[PDB]
Amino acid sequence: MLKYIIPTMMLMPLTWLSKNSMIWINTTLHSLLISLTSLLLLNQFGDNSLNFSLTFFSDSLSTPLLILTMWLLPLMLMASQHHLSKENLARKKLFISMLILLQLFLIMTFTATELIFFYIMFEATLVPTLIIITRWGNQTERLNAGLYFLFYTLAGSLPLLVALIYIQNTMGSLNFLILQYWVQPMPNSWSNTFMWLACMMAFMVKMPLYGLHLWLPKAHVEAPIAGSMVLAAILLKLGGYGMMRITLLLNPITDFMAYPFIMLSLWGMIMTSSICLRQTDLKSLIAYSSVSHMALVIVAILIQTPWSYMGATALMIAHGLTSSMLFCLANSNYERVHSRTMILARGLQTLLPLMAAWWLLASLTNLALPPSINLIGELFVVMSTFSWSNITIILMGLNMVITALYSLYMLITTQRGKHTHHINNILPSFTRENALMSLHMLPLLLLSLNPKIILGPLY
Amino acid sequence: SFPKYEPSRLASLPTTLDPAEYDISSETRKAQAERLAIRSRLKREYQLQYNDPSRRGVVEDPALIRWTCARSANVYPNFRPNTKTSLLGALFGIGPLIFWYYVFKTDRDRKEKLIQEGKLDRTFNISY
Amino acid sequence: MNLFSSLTLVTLILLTMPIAAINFNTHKFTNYPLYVKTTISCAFITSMIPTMMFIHTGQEMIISNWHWLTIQTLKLSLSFKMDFFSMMFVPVALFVTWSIMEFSMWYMHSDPNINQFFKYLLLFLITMLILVTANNLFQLFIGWEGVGIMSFLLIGWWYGRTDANTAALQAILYNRIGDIGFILAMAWFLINLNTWDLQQIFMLNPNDSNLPLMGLILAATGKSAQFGLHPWLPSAMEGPTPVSALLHSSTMVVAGIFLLIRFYPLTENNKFGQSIMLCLGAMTTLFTAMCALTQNDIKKIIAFSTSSQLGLMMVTIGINQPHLAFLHICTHAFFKAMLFMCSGSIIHSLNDEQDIRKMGGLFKAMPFTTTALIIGSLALTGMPFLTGFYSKDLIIESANTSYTNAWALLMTLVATSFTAIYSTRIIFFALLGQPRFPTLININENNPFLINSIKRLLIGSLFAGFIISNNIPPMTIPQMTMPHYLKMTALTVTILGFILALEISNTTHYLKFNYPSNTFKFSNLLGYYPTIMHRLTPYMNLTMSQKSASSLLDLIWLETILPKTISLAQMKMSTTITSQKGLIKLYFLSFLITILISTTLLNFHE
Amino acid sequence: SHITKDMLPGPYPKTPEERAAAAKKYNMRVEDYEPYPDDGMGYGDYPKLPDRSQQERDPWYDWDHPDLRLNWGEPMHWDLDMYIRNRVDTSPTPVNWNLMCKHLFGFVAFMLFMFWVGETYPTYQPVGPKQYPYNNLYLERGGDPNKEPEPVVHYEI
Amino acid sequence: FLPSAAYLTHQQKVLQLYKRALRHLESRCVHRDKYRYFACLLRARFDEHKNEKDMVKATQLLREAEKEFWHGQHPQPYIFPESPGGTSYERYECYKVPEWCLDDWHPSEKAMYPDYFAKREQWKKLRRESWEREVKQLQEETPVGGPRTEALPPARKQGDLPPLWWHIVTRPRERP
Amino acid sequence: DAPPLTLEGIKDRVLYVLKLYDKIDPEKLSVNSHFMKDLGLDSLDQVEIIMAMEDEFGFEIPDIDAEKLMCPQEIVDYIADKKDVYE
Amino acid sequence: SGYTPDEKLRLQQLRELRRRWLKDQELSPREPVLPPRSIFAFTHVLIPVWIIHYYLKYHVTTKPYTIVEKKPRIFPGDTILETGEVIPPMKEFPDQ
């Protein structure tokens, strides 16, 4: 793994001692070289996980998320100009280097052996995105956005530290094999319930669940595109992967104590699909869409079936791709017209004639068009939850109906029917945005061809 | 002849049987004429800020921005926690949640007791 | 046989070349409609041969390869089957859709976005073929949502026209209700029988069958325009004309009931299930019969008629008769595709005004189209004995000699009378009255495309019903022993309906100007169901979703519980602790009470 | 750009000052401005409109946004997103509403009651059972190749 | 609700009632000649009391005529398939691209269309030529501080085009 | 689908279907003829005339226009607004 | 009422402008644009037939549980083509 880590450190002074009108090509070129290098990772086989010696390993769950992350980085690094392509050279290098350091802590967080190393790199993943969205948030409440962001994520993520030091100093070291291979079932005390509540509630904050979901939408609509896509995709699915790690312990008590979290997740999935049917501020609809899909993920994690884990990881990776794409489209529309609202800039079927195809393809992979990976994830989650209970399928299909409803309402609202003929400033599409579209939707359909990769450790 | 068209919050009241249009006063004429004057001044300012060949960007309607600022960030101020809002929040927020939690308790008690008795159809019930 | 599988797979793969071709084109080949037409004709003329081998011998074979995510104790590959239904249905669909290719060459001539149109239409054709071929139920679900979303795009083909995208949103919502029913069926199949396949489920007939059959009922009413979920139908008529022809002739309109014809060994048993089948179908049939009267668009009338025929097919599945229902699918497909195509020819001939008023009389305005429309509207209710005789009359006779639910028989009877009377009324008001139309006619049919397509589908509506009804293996017991006044009563009811609508026309010749007796209003305002449900159910969810969900419960109460109490408590404790006026005596008195409260009250040295 | 006093915190009191300010700010007549009022439900001081407004506004006036029913200066009622055509038809219905729902519910109840009377009362012709010869077609059911011989025969009638 | 006045008049209300009754009776009555008979009957029933000097009697019988017409309407009137609500509702809106576009083309395509774009250049010069001074002078010249109407006077003074002309002249052909 | 409409031909069609109407003459009737002043027919019959033009050409006119046509030339001008009657 | 002279005059100047506009909007250089510069049946009934018939011999004879038939029906009045023997014929008819 350190051969997949140290060129990211050596990629940092590339941006510094690359001169003017030259940083862009060098950063994009070498991050794509890193994408090939990480595409060379996939070797994992059969019985065990793949150890990258003593500090590191990878399950077949961290591997697709890691390859997704290092593929998502050049997409973002090309995505993040035209709102800072006219700013200063030193601040531009600082921005790009902060993105690279952010990627470095993302890979550090996904490739962890010990949960203490995982927690340090977890809040190391936290800290740069704060600076990025607060400095370039481009709206008058980005202060409140970053403030709620850091305070919710620390104030929830903090008792996880105490619980992990407790598991450190009562049951040996914290290898995942040695957290495995040795864990005795801890019975139903109340202290076990508090420790389970600490760990699971910290990652509940990071998902978010329904009771803590207003963490998200300000930190998307008052944030630039780079921090938005990193935030949504890698941070929410990073919290999901963290719970997928830590849920191996405490099995005889999660049955008795995991009923209300399933409950808040289901009812919040329904109410969040309802809340993003009517709003303006187009950027926020994808944020509440992400809240709905992550509530579905949390139902899938807290029931403990291998079918549920396969559907969980498929839904994670497919929704990461879909949400990152659809955020990039909303960025393109806001760069066209500086409104951020929904009812104003209609039309756009006449003009931007092939951008409509990308809105269509993004809204249909958000619709769960059935050969895509998104319906694979949602389908196996529905199968496992109907095995869990015989009556929850009404809530799942009700989510499905309203999800199709708001996604296709987003499609036929902003880009269907009538130009308001006072806009009269938008230019036709650049090759850069369409290049980002072809960066988005070719890996999703290629994974739809060969999906035996992204299914989890319980393949 | 006709039952005189009762209204509702769905059945809109048409322009024919108002019937309050037919109670013509100077007050209503002055109100309609000043309403026409308001829409006149607004359309004139729009057409002056609409037809210029140098004006590149959008029209920048302050009414739409006023509606968005009223709808998004003017929710939480202003507010006072009253009896009505608290009862409506606790009726719509914890009520149906404890309803679905009670019925999941019921279905899980039935399934647990039945498969503890062992009278389930699991001759082959593999994909759990 | 190698020839059988080879020709079926090349009929599948001939429906692959034009899409990749004008994905990789980069040069605007203007003969692309001709290209799509000739490859669909070649696909049909290759598809006739393995069906001929099938009826010649049998040899009913399944193909399955390229497995993917064979994960737990199931596997799933690309897998589809060549049996009676999946082999007989496909050349009918290719032939019908090829006629629609001709009529869509002509009718959609003067719009320069024709290539996108034919791409979408061929892609929808591929998806409906994928639906009707598969045996692995995941691929059935793929075809289901694919034909739903291609239906969405072809209804909302005309951007602008808020009728169209509103209507398409209605169609996609009822498709997702079909989705929730179908995934309930899929979930039961997985968890109780380890797979979702025809073969293993029909190999092991279960005992408990309430839940998957109710899921099949919900998918069938989600797709096949049934009662409670029907009113997306004039909605779907608000699109283009050959779009509506393909959308409600064969494809996308049978997929709700084709699934029930697929699961016929599962619905061999469960008398409760077949009671639900036939009662729901009779409810649909009566409501479409009473609703189709007093209607002004042509498309809404023909759509209510095909919904009534779908109701008859649900009755046919209520009785243990799958194969008569499948034969009725085929004959109905030929029949009303020909009828939609001729009606759209008329509508383009009169400047796209489309209403029956200001269309009054157009016989001898060329009688090719009036001949086509009367061959249609007479072959409905079965001119004895033609293509429309066979399916409809064997359905009602097999219903007559069965275990009927004592009201559905009268439902089929009165609905047959009603479809007779609106067939007669649409003939009279379209072609046989005083000629009302605006001046400056442009009535032109100097056209090889029109005469070829109408010609070949009237040839189909004359021969293909008998050609289907001869050479099929009889998979059921024909009844064949009917009493007096039971075989006769079908044609009796249709003839008395003809006389009934004839005297309706003779009262229309009079002049009295009577008043609507409010059965008029119930029949004309669509049974009040679309207006009431579309003004009620959007209002409830979005009245709650603003007041409770967005404004009230999430934002303002969740911000008063988690941030506000904490932040206000921190502000109060800060402004009461660190806001002290700068004196000395108070600080040393605080030291004094700290010393006393440490020594004597709560001890530290004891 | 946008004035700080073109936001709208605070409710309606007092009756001279804030009503005059809302008349100046919302581009409306003084008495046509009416707050909801504030029953504690937020809402700022955003006006009340005639609430239907979308199947109203007959399209031959030819205003500035035809599919949006704007006029660039209208106050844009609080439930705008629930009102645009493609959402809710706020037309005057040609008959009623309560009379419509009484007709429809009576019809659905009548048809379901005739269905129930059918469900308790089946129909059948003078027809006996189908005579399956080999012990109600034994040896091709879901088992029993040798287990239970069940002798039952038909008689020639 | 009209650009010229604040209210229509009583006579316009009776007039629109005549037009709507005639249209709904078209939609009610087929065969067109019994329709012609009943339309003459409607013309006679309006000729019952045309000669009223009273005004409250006029508006009271107008209100009762509205009641009688609402009792005798039709659910689907024969709205023309050109008008909104009918079958058009801008049916061919697919190709109604406005003319602030068509200038954002590459100069290869502008070299393909030389003459049309040169004439568009002279139209754009005609727009820019007397845009500022004459139109600002006529729009600041004629009204009182209250506009009180939604029309505008033509350029009757000396020379050029009447003001605020561009988006009314430049429009789609309504059959593109 | 659109036959070639010219100005003078559609003017002749409008004046022709006015001439087919009974209670006005073909004699003292031209393009610059009025509907209230010289022929002296009422507003009610004027709206019957407007309904005849609508039922021939197949599109309504708005009631913002309905008072103020009064002569065939301005009728030709409004129909030329509707159809864009040129090459 | 009728047209005001304002309406008459303004509407006539827009007549002149709109008619000159559509008078312009017919493009005619007498050349609209200018450029910068059996076998179907053969390929579509021989090439995919060859590719698929290759694909349905050798890869299907690699993968064992693959395309399978539903059995050809044999009768009492028939024989077996493979080894060569008859099924003995169907028995006596009576009471036609």
What is the distance between the alpha carbons of residues A373 and A379, in angstroms, rounded to a whole number? 10
* Contact at CB, E97 and A350, closer than 8 angstroms: yes
Q: How far apart are CA A326 and CA A284, in angstroms?
A: 11
With beta carbons less than 8 A apart as the criterion, state whether C150 and C47 touch.
Answer: no
CB–CB of C183 and A416 under 8 A? no
Please enumerate in sequence order all residues whose Cβ is within 8 A of that of A172, keeping only pairs 6 or more positions apart, or say none: A178, A182
* Subunit contact C176:A213, Cβ cutoff 8 A: no
- Distance, in angstroms, between F26 CA and closest chain C CA? 21
Query: Residue A103: left if φ>0, alpha if ψ -120 to 50, beta else—which one?
Result: alpha
Q: Which chains touch B (3 or more CB pairs under 8 A)?
A: A, C, D, E
**Residue A8, both tokens:** 């990211």
Chains touching G (at least 3 CB pairs under 8 A) are: C, E, F
H helix runs in G25-91, sequence order: 39-55, 58-62
Q: How far apart (Å, rounded) are the C-alpha atoms in residues C428 and C356?
A: 10
Give the containing element (helix H, strand E) for G80: strand G79-80
Chain B's closest residue to A306, CA to CA, is: B128
Nearest by CB to D94, which of E2, E3, E73?
E73
Q: Which residues of D touch C547 (CB under 8 A)?
A: 41
Classify G96 as helix, strand or coil.
coil
Domains of chain F (ranges; CATH) run 9-83 (1.10.1200.10)
What residues are paired with A41 via a beta bridge?
none
Residue of C528, C556, C564, C568 to mutate for B, most B C-beta atoms under 10 A: C556
CA of D90 to nearest chain A CA: how many angstroms apart?
18
Residue F57 CA to residue C440 CA, distance in Å, equals 9
Q: Work out the angle at residue F67's Cα, subtended by the Cα atoms of residues F66 and F69, and round it to the nearest 5 degrees.
A: 80
Using an 8 Å CB-CB cutoff, list chain A residues near B74.
none
CA dist G6 and F77 (Å) reads: 16
Helical H segments across E29-85, by residue range = 33-46, 56-71
G91 touches chain C (CB under 8 A): no
Give the Cα separation of C325 and C317 in Å (integer).
7
Spatial contact of A231 and A199, defined as CB atoms under 8 Å apart: no
Hey, what are C85's tokens? 């239904």
Catalytic annotation, pick one of F1, F12, F25, F42: F42
Which residues of chain G does E155 touch, with a Cβ-Cβ cutoff of 8 Å? 13
Beta A56-58 vs C78-82: how paired, if at all? unpaired
Closest to A30 measured CA to CA, from A17, A54, A14? A14
DSSP codes, C240-298: -HHHHHHHTTTTTTSHHHHHHHHTTTTTSS-HHHHHHHHHHHHHHHHHHHHHHSS--BH
Contact residues, chain A, for C562 at CB < 8 Å: 211-212
Instruction: Specify the DSSP element, H or E, that contains A369.
Output: none
- Which residues numbered 65-104 in C keep a CB inside 8 Å of some CB on D? none
DSSP code of C208? -
> Residue A52: beta bridge partners?
A56
Give G-chain residues touching C13 at CB under 8 angstroms. Answer: 48, 52
The answer to whether the bond into A218 is cis (omega within 30° of 0) is no
Residue in chain C closest to F58 (alpha carbons) equals C438
d(CA A281, CA A342): 6
* Resolution expressed in Å: 4.1
Query: Is residue A444 within a helix (H) or strand (E), and if so which, with residue range?
Result: helix A431-449
Active site residue F1: no
Q: Which tokens go with F36? A: 């209230």
* Residue E156 Cα, gap to closest chain A Cα (Å): 29
Structure tokens at C570: 């921190």
User: Searching chain E, which residue's CA lies closest to the CA of residue B16?
Assistant: E66
Inter-chain CB proximity A427 and E104 less than 8 Å: yes
C562-570 LR contacts (CB < 8 Å, sep 24+): C562/A211, C562/A212, C563/A148
Residues whose CB falls within 8 Å of the CB of residue C460, separated by 6 or more in sequence, listed in order: C95, C334, C338
**What distance in Å separates the CA atoms of residue E137 and residue C443, rounded to the nearest whole number?**
55
Report CA Rg, chain E.
25
C-alpha distances (whole Å) from C338 to each of B122, C195, C251, C296, C343 are 52, 40, 14, 20, 9
Residues of A in contact with B58 (CB under 8 A): 337-339, 344, 422-423, 425
Q: Which of C524, C346, A6, C8 is nearest to E75 (CA)?
A: C524
| Residue labelled with tokens 């030529």 | E129
Q: Per the CB < 8 Å rule, is C351 touching F1? A: yes
d(CA B87, CA B98): 16
Q: How far apart are CA D72 and CA D58, in angstroms?
A: 17
CA A89 to centroid of chain Cα atoms: 30
- Looking up tokens 């022809």 gives C245
Question: Which of D66, D81, D82 has its CB closest to that of A418?
Answer: D66
Task: Give the chain D residue whose CA is nearest to the CA of A281.
Answer: D81
Q: What are the sequence ranges of the domains in chain E?
A: 8-77, 97-173
Chain F residues whose beta carbon lies within 8 Å of the beta carbon of residue E23:
51
Q: Are A276 and A288 in contact (CB under 8 A)?
A: yes
After which residue numbers is chain A interrupted with C–N beyond 2.5 angstroms? none
Q: What CA–CA distance (Å, rounded) separates C58 from C588? A: 107
CA–CA separation, A375 vs A367, rounded Å? 8
Candidates C171, C176, C142; CA nearest to C244 is: C171
Q: Which H, E and C letters describe chain B, residue by residue?
A: CCCCCCCCCCCCCCCCCCCHHHCCCHHHHHHHHHHHHHHHHHHHHHHHCCCCCCCCCCCCCHHHHHHHHHHCCCCCCCCCCCHHHHHHHHHHHCHHHHHHHHHHHHHHHHHHHHHHHCCCCCCCCCCC
Tokens of A148: 């709620």
**Omega into C385 within 30° of 0, i.e. cis?**
yes
Q: Which helix (H) or strand (E) holds G85?
A: strand G85-86
Interface of C with G in 36-75 (CB under 8 A): 38-39, 42, 46, 57-65
Query: What are the backbone dihedrals phi and psi of residue A112, each rounded to the nearest 5 degrees, phi first?
Result: -125, 140
Q: Which distant-in-sequence residues (6+ apart) come within 8 Å of E27 by Cβ?
A: C357, E74, E76, E77, E78
Burial F40-50 (b: 16+ CB within 10 A, else e): ebebeebbbbb
Residues of E in contact with D57 (CB under 8 A): 1
Touching check for F63 and chain D: CB below 8 Å? yes
Task: Tell me the one-letter amino acid at A329.
Answer: L
Q: Which two tokens stand for residue E159?
A: 């020379």
Single out the residue of E5, A184, D101 nearest to residue C528, CA to CA.
Answer: D101
Give CB contacts under 8 A, 24+ apart, made by A446-451: A447/A317, A447/A318, A447/A373, A448/A371, A448/A372, A448/A373, A450/C68, A451/A314, A451/A373, A451/A376, A451/C68, A451/C69
Cβ distance C436 to E32 less than 8 Å, yes or no, reads yes
Peptide bond into C444 cis (omega under 30): no
Do D61 and E2 lie within an 8 Å CB cutoff? yes
Q: Is E98 on the interface with G (CB under 8 A)?
A: no
Kind and range of the H or E run holding C82: strand C78-82
Q: Do D81 and A343 touch (CB under 8 A)?
A: yes
Contacts of E96 in chain A (CB under 8 A): 350
- Kindly determine whether residue G26 and residue F70, on different chains, have CB atoms separated by under 8 Å: no
Q: Which chains touch F (3 or more CB pairs under 8 A)?
A: C, D, E, G
Nearest to B128 among A305, A343, A389 (CB): A305
**φ and ψ at residue A73, rounded to 5 degrees:** -60, -50
Instruction: State the Cα–Cα distance between residues E132 and E142, nearest whole angstrom.
Output: 16
Experimental method: cryo-EM
